[PDB]
């Protein structure tokens, strides 16, 4: 399935993540179509960067995020906008 | 690696007072060894180049690869003169900052203070004598370590400091106030010879 | 040359080659072929140990060993230093390098590796010739 998930980067014991649009068939780090932001919890809070337009376009086109990405997009208000646009 | 060996031996090979004292040249201004005082023969341009390079890394207690990388990072600059920028980047090392501020008598003493952690930058401990320093920062002795008698002796035995620095004794904090300058550095060195050396 | 000539036949470089072809080859017992492998060192079995007379400006007894390699190429090497524990059938390790005295010796023997004993009472240039420190 087409999905919106996050891939691992940075050194060991100091992680970092890029939100990415990946099929479930591809690897954790491998094929992707588009990057729409990035993430790390290494701050005292979590810290986030996002590309609302493209991520909402993929969600419309049929994407299916993971749980933690759903949490992030909730905090950033994208899931709510997608819901509204479907209403 | 760090050099635990004699100071005067190096200084009197090179034919220069590194400490600016003189007694690393006084009474014996000739290269070490039992072929020291006798008639040295001619010497080559490669020898002169190597000697100039060794002057600097023996001042700053540095390693060849650190020296080379710092040379390359100076080469990456276009806004000035090459070897002068090299010397400035040497000056921006806590080993030399501690010395120029009069907070220690020797660069070895200074490196030991830095690494043992008696010094701060903007209020944060640093055990890294190679730590680069930008113009505007604030070096500061550790407020617990201000009680050691060695540093107080070294600070109250201070001759007039350089022009490119600011410093207070009660606060034991100082900083650079300039790039700093070239001519205010040791003019005994010919940086062009280092340039030709590492142009190879 | 004209450019037409340089297109009809291009510049074909001066072919190069090694000072140690024996090290640049291998052997698999299954297919039994020279496998081309760039190996710095090799193992061998001394098939003879002897002395040779060097070229004219020099005069000496240069100690050599003819050796049977892992790759079944038989090779003449030099026994550097002063003294050796070597005999026929003595396992030995070989490195590259000419011996400018005799022509037919493109190789050297390594000390402190295998059955080759370390040199005895060599204190300077000691890694070379392979003998542990005097404490």
């Amino acid at each position: 399935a087409v999905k919106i998930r996050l891939k691992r980067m940075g050194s060991k014991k100091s992680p970092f993540y890029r939100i990415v649009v990946a099929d479930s068939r591809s690897p954790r780090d491998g094929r992707f179509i588009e990057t729409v932001g990035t993430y790390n919890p290494l701050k005292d809070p979590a810290e986030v960067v996002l590309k609302e337009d493209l991520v909402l376009d993929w969600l419309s086109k049929g994407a299916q995020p993971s749980d933690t990405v759903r949490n992030i997009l909730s905090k950033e208000g994208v899931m709510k906008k997608h819901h509204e646009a479907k209403n | 690696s760090r050099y635990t060996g004699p100071s005067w031996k190096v200084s009197r090979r090179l034919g220069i007072s590194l400490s600016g004292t003189g007694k690393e040249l006084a009474r014996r201004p000739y290269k070490p060894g039992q072929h020291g005082p006798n008639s040295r023969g001619k010497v080559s341009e490669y020898g002169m180049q190597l000697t100039e390079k060794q002057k600097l890394r023996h001042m700053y207690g540095m390693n060849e690869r650190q020296f080379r990388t710092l040379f390359i990072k100076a080469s990456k600059i276009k806004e000035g003169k090459h070897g002068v920028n090299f010397m400035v980047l040497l000056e921006q090392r806590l080993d030399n900052v501690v010395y120029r501020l009069g907070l220690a008598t020797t660069r070895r003493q200074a490196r030991q203070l830095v690494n043992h952690g008696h010094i701060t930058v903007d209020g944060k401990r640093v055990d890294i004598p190679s730590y680069h320093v930008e113009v505007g920062q604030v070096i500061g002795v550790r407020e617990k370590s201000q009680n050691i008698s060695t540093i107080k002796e070294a600070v109250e035995a201070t001759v007039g400091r350089p022009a490119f620095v600011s410093f207070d004794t009660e606060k034991l904090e100082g900083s650079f106030t300039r790039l700093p300058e070239r001519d205010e550095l040791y003019p005994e060195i010919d940086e062009a010879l280092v340039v030709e050396y590492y142009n190879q | 040359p004209t450019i037409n000539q340089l297109v009809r036949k291009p510049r074909k470089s001066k072919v190069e080659k090694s000072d140690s072809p024996a090290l640049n080859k291998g052997y698999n017992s299954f297919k039994k072929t020279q496998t081309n492998v760039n190996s710095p060192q090799k193992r061998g079995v001394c098939t003879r140990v002897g002395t040779m007379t060097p070229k004219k400006p020099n005069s000496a007894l240069r100690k050599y060993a003819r050796v049977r390699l892992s790759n079944l190429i038989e090779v003449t090497a030099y026994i550097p230093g002063i003294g050796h524990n070597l005999q026929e059938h003595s396992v030995v390790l070989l490195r590259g390098g000419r011996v400018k005295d005799l022509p037919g010796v493109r190789y050297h023997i390594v000390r402190g590796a295998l059955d080759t004993a370390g040199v005895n009472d060599r204190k300077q240039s000691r890694s070379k010739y392979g003998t542990k420190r005097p404490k």
Binding site: - | H82, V195, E196, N199 | -
Partner: protein, 163 residues
């Protein structure tokens, strides 16, 4: 063309111990090549011979003073690229950027440091004979030109030429 009223300082390229042969063996002499200049444009070279190093040096200096030439400069650089040939010694010299320093390892480095060219890119293509490489060097520096001279020849203005 006059060494008078100039602070010419010298530098020795090489001393080639050179022999003549006689019934009584070998007559060994020293031949020296010296390059002298003022680091303003004016530079020359000289060949000396003698049974003594300093005597041949003196003779070569005194012959170099009598054979000077002036090189143009542009911010411690030459104006344009040039190829100098003199019988087996090809040297190409390019105008380099400022701060890049000299690119040579003697004798060309000596010639150009004495002439006052602080920043240049050079290369010895052919032989390595110091005499002929130095001669090809001065031949190239003679091939070189001045914008004012070329513009006064052509009639066009300086800006009208460089564009």
């Amino acid at each position: 063309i006059d060494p008078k009223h100039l602070e010419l300082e010298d530098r020795v390229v090489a001393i080639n111990r050179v022999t003549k042969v006689v019934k009584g063996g070998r007559r060994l002499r020293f031949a020296a090549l010296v390059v002298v200049g003022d680091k303003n444009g004016h530079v020359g070279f000289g060949t000396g011979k003698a049974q003594e190093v300093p005597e041949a040096i003196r003779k070569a200096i005194e012959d170099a003073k009598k054979n000077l030439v002036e090189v143009p400069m542009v911010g411690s650089t030459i104006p344009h690229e040039v190829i100098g040939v003199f019988g087996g010694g090809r040297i190409l010299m390019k105008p380099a950027v400022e701060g890049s320093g000299v690119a040579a390892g003697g004798p060309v480095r000596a010639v150009l440091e004495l002439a006052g060219v602080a920043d240049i890119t050079s290369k010895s293509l052919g032989s390595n004979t110091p005499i002929n490489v130095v001669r090809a060097t001065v031949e190239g520096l003679k091939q070189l030109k001045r914008a004012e001279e070329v513009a006064a020849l052509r009639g066009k203005s300086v800006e009208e030429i460089i564009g």
